């Protein structure tokens, strides 16, 4: 069947430390705080700097935490007016953003650039995507896979890897299939299965950290195959190495960040 994306192959791909510029397209009034997950995701991860295209709201909450990153005003908004003028060695849009067509014009802009584009959360929608050279990663959950595709939860669960290889090549896009076992699906029939993670990652915004985690990695990692599977495998590893002490039930989001540092030495 599927084989697992393991710690030889982590070890064997994992970059040794300019390392990009990458935007993050996230957060809004009400879902502020996944723009706050997804950019210490992402800076933890390897990045060379970090532009948040935030609400300007949503910027106030960030800096204190994460003063390391810069701020692209009101962006995900004026994405949705024009091509970005910057160029940027990653992009994720999507956390914290609402599943509205402005959100979906700011997409289609984005994907004009010439570098890997992350999908997540209020980015994913049901759609096609355009032929270019960079790849295109959605990271859904089950119900995300649902909107997507039309496939119902209780149908995909029971065929996850299938549906997940299914799709992955009908769309071209890569495809993160949250879950126990996340499936990493690739365009050109490569696919994977996540050994890490446990029950303490079923939680709001760990989808989040995940999202910045894949953009970060996908800064300092030559193949952007690499740098997702890598971050699928490593978000999990972190919460994995906090129930040795703690109970899994009560790991925040947040806090996988925090365990990265320590993890990733591990596997260096």
């Not at 299965?193 to 760990?206: D, E, F, R, V, Y």
Request: proline letters at 7%.
């Amino acid at each position: 069947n599927v084989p697992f994306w393991t710690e030889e192959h982590v070890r064997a791909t994992l970059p040794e430390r300019t390392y990009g510029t990458a935007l993050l397209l996230a957060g809004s009034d009400d879902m502020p705080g996944a723009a706050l997950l997804a950019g210490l995701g992402a800076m933890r991860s390897g990045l060379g700097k970090l532009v948040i295209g935030t609400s300007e709201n949503v910027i106030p909450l960030i800096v204190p935490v994460l003063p390391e990153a810069t701020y692209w005003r009101d962006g995900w908004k004026k994405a949705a007016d024009a091509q970005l003028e910057e160029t940027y060695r990653a992009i994720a849009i999507g956390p914290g953003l609402p599943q509205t067509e402005s959100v979906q014009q700011a997409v289609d802009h984005v994907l004009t650039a010439d570098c890997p584009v992350i999908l997540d959360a209020g980015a994913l929608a049901k759609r096609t995507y355009p032929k270019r050279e960079g790849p295109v990663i959605l990271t859904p959950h089950p119900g995300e896979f649902f909107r997507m595709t039309g496939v119902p939860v209780n149908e995909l669960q029971k065929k996850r890897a299938e549906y997940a290889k299914e799709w992955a090549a009908q769309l071209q896009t890569v495809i993160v299939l949250k879950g126990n076992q996340t499936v990493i699906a690739f365009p050109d029939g490569d696919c994977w299965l996540n050994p890490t993670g446990n029950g303490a990652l079923a939680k709001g915004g760990t989808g989040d950290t995940l999202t910045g985690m894949i953009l970060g990695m996908l800064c300092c990692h030559e193949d952007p195959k690499h740098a997702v599977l890598n971050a699928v495998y490593l978000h999990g590893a972190c919460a994995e190495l906090w129930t040795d002490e703690h109970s899994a039930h009560t790991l925040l989001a947040h806090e996988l960040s925090d365990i990265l540092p320590r993890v990733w030495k591990r596997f260096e």
